Amino acid sequence: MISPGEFMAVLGPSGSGKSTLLKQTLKRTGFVAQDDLLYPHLTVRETLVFVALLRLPRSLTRDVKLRAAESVISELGLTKCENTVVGNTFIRGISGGERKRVSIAHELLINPSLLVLDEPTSGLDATAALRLVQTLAGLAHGKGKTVVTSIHQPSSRVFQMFDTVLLLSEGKCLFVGKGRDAMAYFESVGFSPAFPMNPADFLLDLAITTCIATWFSQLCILLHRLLKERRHESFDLLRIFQVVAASILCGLMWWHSDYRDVHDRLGLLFFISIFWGVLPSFNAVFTFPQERAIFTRERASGMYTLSSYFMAHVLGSLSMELVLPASFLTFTYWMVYLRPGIVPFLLTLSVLLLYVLASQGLGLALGAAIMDAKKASTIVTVTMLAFVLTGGYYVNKVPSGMVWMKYVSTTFYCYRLLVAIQYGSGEEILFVEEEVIGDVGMWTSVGVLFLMFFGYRVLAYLALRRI
Amino acid sequence: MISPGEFMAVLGPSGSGKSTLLKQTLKRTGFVAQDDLLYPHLTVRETLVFVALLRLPRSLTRDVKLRAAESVISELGLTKCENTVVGNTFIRGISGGERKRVSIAHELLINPSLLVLDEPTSGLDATAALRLVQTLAGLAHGKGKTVVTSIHQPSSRVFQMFDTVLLLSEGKCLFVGKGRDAMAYFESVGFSPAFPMNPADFLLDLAITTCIATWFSQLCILLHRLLKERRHESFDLLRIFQVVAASILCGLMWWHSDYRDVHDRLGLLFFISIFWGVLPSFNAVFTFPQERAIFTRERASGMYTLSSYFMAHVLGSLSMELVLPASFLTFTYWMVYLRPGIVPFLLTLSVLLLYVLASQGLGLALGAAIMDAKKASTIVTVTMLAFVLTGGYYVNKVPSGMVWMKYVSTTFYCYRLLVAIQYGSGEEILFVEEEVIGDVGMWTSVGVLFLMFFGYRVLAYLALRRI
Numbered sequence: 047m048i049s050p051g052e053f054m055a056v057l058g059p060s061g062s063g064k065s066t067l068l069k070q071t072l073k074r075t076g077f078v079a080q081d082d083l084l085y086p087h088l089t090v091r092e093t094l095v096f097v098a099l100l101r102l103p104r105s106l107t108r109d110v111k112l113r114a115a116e117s118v119i120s121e122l123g124l125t126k127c128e129n130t131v132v133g134n135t136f137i138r139g140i141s142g143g144e145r146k147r148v149s150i151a152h153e154l155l156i157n158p159s160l161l162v163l164d165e166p167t168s169g170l171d172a173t174a175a176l177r178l179v180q181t182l183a184g185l186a187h188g189k190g191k192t193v194v195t196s197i198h199q200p201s202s203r204v205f206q207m208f209d210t211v212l213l214l215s216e217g218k219c220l221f222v223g224k225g226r227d228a229m230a231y232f233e234s235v236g237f238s239p240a241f242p243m244n245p246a247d248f249l250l251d252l253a254i255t256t257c258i259a260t261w262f263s264q265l266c267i268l269l270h271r272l273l274k275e276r277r278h279e280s281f282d283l284l285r286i287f288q289v290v291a292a293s294i295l296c297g298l299m300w301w302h303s304d305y306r307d308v309h310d311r312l313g314l315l316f317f318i319s320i321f322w323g324v325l326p327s328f329n330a331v332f333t334f335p336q337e338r339a340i341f342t343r344e345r346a347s348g349m350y351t352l353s354s355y356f357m358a359h360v361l362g363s364l365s366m367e368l369v370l371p372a373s374f375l376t377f378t379y380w381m382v383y384l385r386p387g388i389v390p391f392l393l394t395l396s397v398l399l400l401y402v403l404a405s406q407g408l409g410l411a412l413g414a415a416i417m418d419a420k421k422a423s424t425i426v427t428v429t430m431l432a433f434v435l436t437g438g439y440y441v442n443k444v445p446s447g448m449v450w451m452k453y454v455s456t457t458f459y460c461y462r463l464l465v466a467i468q469y470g471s472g473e474e475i476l477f478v479e480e481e482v483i484g485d486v487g488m489w490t491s492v493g494v495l496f497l498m499f500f501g502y503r504v505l506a507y508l509a510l511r512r513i
Numbered sequence: 514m515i516s517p518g519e520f521m522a523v524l525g526p527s528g529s530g531k532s533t534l535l536k537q538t539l540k541r542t543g544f545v546a547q548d549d550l551l552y553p554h555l556t557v558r559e560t561l562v563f564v565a566l567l568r569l570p571r572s573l574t575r576d577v578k579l580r581a582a583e584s585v586i587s588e589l590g591l592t593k594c595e596n597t598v599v600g601n602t603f604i605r606g607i608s609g610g611e612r613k614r615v616s617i618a619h620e621l622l623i624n625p626s627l628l629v630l631d632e633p634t635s636g637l638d639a640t641a642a643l644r645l646v647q648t649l650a651g652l653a654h655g656k657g658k659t660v661v662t663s664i665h666q667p668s669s670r671v672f673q674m675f676d677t678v679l680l681l682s683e684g685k686c687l688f689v690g691k692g693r694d695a696m697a698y699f700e701s702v703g704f705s706p707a708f709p710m711n712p713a714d715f716l717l718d719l720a721i722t723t724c725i726a727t728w729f730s731q732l733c734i735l736l737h738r739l740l741k742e743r744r745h746e747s748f749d750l751l752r753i754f755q756v757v758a759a760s761i762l763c764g765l766m767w768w769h770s771d772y773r774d775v776h777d778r779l780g781l782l783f784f785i786s787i788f789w790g791v792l793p794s795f796n797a798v799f800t801f802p803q804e805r806a807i808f809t810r811e812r813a814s815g816m817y818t819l820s821s822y823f824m825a826h827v828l829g830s831l832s833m834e835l836v837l838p839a840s841f842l843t844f845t846y847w848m849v850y851l852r853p854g855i856v857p858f859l860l861t862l863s864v865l866l867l868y869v870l871a872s873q874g875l876g877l878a879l880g881a882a883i884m885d886a887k888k889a890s891t892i893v894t895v896t897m898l899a900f901v902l903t904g905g906y907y908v909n910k911v912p913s914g915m916v917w918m919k920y921v922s923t924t925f926y927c928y929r930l931l932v933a934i935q936y937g938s939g940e941e942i943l944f945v946e947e948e949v950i951g952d953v954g955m956w957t958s959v960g961v962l963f964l965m966f967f968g969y970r971v972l973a974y975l976a977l978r979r980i
């Protein structure tokens with residue numbers, strides 16, 4: 047039993063059952079886990095106001111939501127670090143204490159009366175944990191919040207701040223009540239310390255239109271939230287360097303490529319298709335396993351739906367996955383001197399953008415299907431290799447009983463589209479018939495690529511819904 | 514001042530200077546760091562006995578070296594976990610306490626009188642930390658070892674076990690002497706507890722032929738030690754499944770490929786070169802950053818030299834990355850029905866193996882040149898793309914401005930060797946002249962391949978000597 051405004055600490059050794067022990071009631075109940083599953087690119091204020099808009103009811107406007115988020119940030123002592131990104135182990139951001147306080151404010155925006163916390167002071171410095179428990183006690187007492195927390199091991203100053211201590215050991219309960227008399231209770235049984243020591247250490251030793259409006263609003267919200275995530279890969283130094291190196295390589299190798307040498311242009315188009323099939327799919331396959339945990343945690347509270355998250359993710363990724371291929375095509379066309387014309391330029395640009403979107407959708411679907419990031423990446427690589435080997439440029443004599451594979455590979459279709467844009471039906475050129483004219487036309491290839499992209503998105507959505 | 518046989522600890526907050534504070538004298542001094550930089554594939558016994566062979570002098574026989582290693586293992590309570598791999602965060606192995614005990618025994622093989630321990634107790638379970646401190650105190654008392662350790666925060670039972678306690682704050686010493694008298698001294702100064710609490714928390718609040726023989730023996734033991742790592746560095750399904758799928762789909766794509774269609778076979782050879790140029794290079798680029806820290810720590814003690822470590826690693830890699838290409842060729846040659854003959858089979862197998870070795874050397878050199886794993890991998894990808902684009906199969910009309918790319922690449926040489934093996938000079942075949950005959954001879958290409966295979970490891974060695 048816990049009274050409102052009382053601070054309870056769940057004490058016990060590792061594996062004693064502290065984690066497992068911890069609709070209107072759930073609405074006012076805020077649960078915080080040990081892991082700080084937060085986006086590392088959003089700053090403090092940005093993240094808390096986003097959670098405020100994504101969790102608070104629609105009867106509250108955006109300006110007052112921002113004001114409430116700012117008040118929560120200032121109440122948790124995050125004013126100094128409000129101008130810094132959250133960060134993670136990879137990219138430097140706020141400290142561990144600030145990150146844990148941001149995680150607390152994530153559930154504090156709903157204004158919960160029953161705050162359950164699993165290991166908040168675990169894994170941080172003595173002073174950071176001391177400040178965290180000071181803040182938690184202040185919220186519990188001054189604001190009258192029913193706070194139940196679990197700590198693997200508290201410090202002395204940390205230990206002396208809980209008004210209630212509940213003791214677990216190997217799944218059973220040993221003591222419940224105030225921390226001050228606890229030793230006395232043990233002194234009732236005959237367990238007295240043999241030396242000056244922290245009483246916490248003894249404890250361990252002894253142990254319809256509205257729905258559409260909400261959908262659109264939260265979809266735009268999640269899209270704006272993931273713009274920050276996409277901005278990293280938009281200007282990733284390694285990615286930009288690789289893209290510009292490939293562009294310069296294509297420009298120099300095919301410098302002022304003529305229309306007479308069909309083989310050189312065919313190889314250039316096939317290489318472009320290979321690059322823009324492998325890179326987007328490989329990039330997209332990593333996101334879904336990486337954000338799976340945070341998506342599950344956020345969906346458990348019911349803050350947002352799966353379809354809105356998926357649409358926001360694809361909308362955010364479209365700009366990142368289209369900015370680079372456009373510049374790559376601009377540089378390559380203006381360096382290697384492919385077929386002149388603004389209309390062919392727009393046609394090939396749209397063709398490659400559609401192919402890149404299809405490859406990104408395939409990568410997202412494969413990442414959704416496989417719960418392991420490395421195995422999903424391996425499957426993506428294998429599928430892309432099987433596709434490129436069936437693109438019509440490496441092998442010209444496909445076995446009769448196997449041809450259906452080249453009818454499902456997107457890189458095939460992209461290569462045929464590129465060849466059609468560069469030379470048409472081969473009337474000017476007229477091996478030519480099989481490598482230029484092809485067996486699949488312009489509009490049918492475009493429709494097949496669009497259908498493949500849409501099907502990949504649908505399959506990814508089905509895989510996400512399966513879990 | 515610390516006397517032999519006394520358990521001394523250094524206490525203070527993070528950043529107080531505990532880390533910085535902690536030839537015969539250093540030969541008998543064993544230093545252990547916080548990080549357990551150990552190979553995750555060797556079992557508990559295996560790495561211990563190997564460090565014994567690599568550290569103890571040559572006047573100490575192998576059988577009794579193993580006996581001493583077993584005695585040390587049993588002395589540190591590793592008998593139960595001796596049949597389990599050390600492991601890491603990726604692959605499951607021994608527990609944190611067992612791993613730290615293995616790290617202690619790593620320096621305990623040399624039998625050091627002065628054991629320095631830079632934060633070994635930090636970040637483990639209460640019972641594991643208690644066992645570690647009990648083992649350390651037992652060693653310090655019974656064996657008379659001068660132990661100087663550091664702890665970020667000790668438990669009460671842990672804290673009551675040190676004979677000597679040093680106290681640091683912001684780089685300045687505050688208290689020196691026994692832990693028991695620290696409370697009395699601080700009370701005399703005028704600092705007394707306001708509640709029952711652990712005095713450890715109290716402290717924080719205020720705060721020629723012989724050389725060749727040695728080279729050969731240590732090279733051999735290093736190679737044997739690295740064999741365990743090479744056993745599963747890439748044997749995981751992520752790569753063997755990809756290789757077998759590539760073999761199956763390559764054999765099925767060119768199923769009974771004829772000798773008449775030059776383009777198909779040439780594309781197959783080019784794709785094989787592309788597959789075996791980037792895969793070994795990508796595999797090799799990740800081994801060097803990963804092992805950089807452990808190599809630096811192990812070289813700091815002078816246990817082994819740089820050249821022997823390089824030779825052992827290269828021998829392990831050669832034993833590693835030859836079976837997979839051998840199986841690939843063996844499947845592909847018989848599935849696609851290439852030119853008949855055992856001698857051509859051996860020729861192309863040797864060519865592919867040498868090409869794989871050259872790619873491995875390029876990857877190792879690029880990984881050694883760049884101190885960042887991701888940057889080195891990106892540079893490897895860019896360079897391999899540059900070599901692939903200038904292989905003579907994509908762009909037939911290479912401009913004279915950058916044609917020297919084809920004179921420094923590796924995929925080009927492998928492709929020329931493969932075509933000169935499959936079709937020779939083209940007399941049977943006789944676009945043919947440029948794509949079959951070429952301008953680089955078979956023996957010249959083989960010599961260039963071998964020269965670059967040696968020079969890549971030479972570059973890697975010079976890069977290692979630089980840092």
Ligand SMILES: CC1=CC(=O)CC(C)(C)[C@@]1(O)/C=C/C(C)=C\C(=O)O
Pocket residue numbers: 320324325328427430431434787791792795894
């Ligand atoms: C883009 C990329 C990602 C990887 O993980 C493997 C590797 C580095 C080899 C690769 O360059 C793959 C290239 C492929 C499949 C084909 C090619 O290049 O013709």
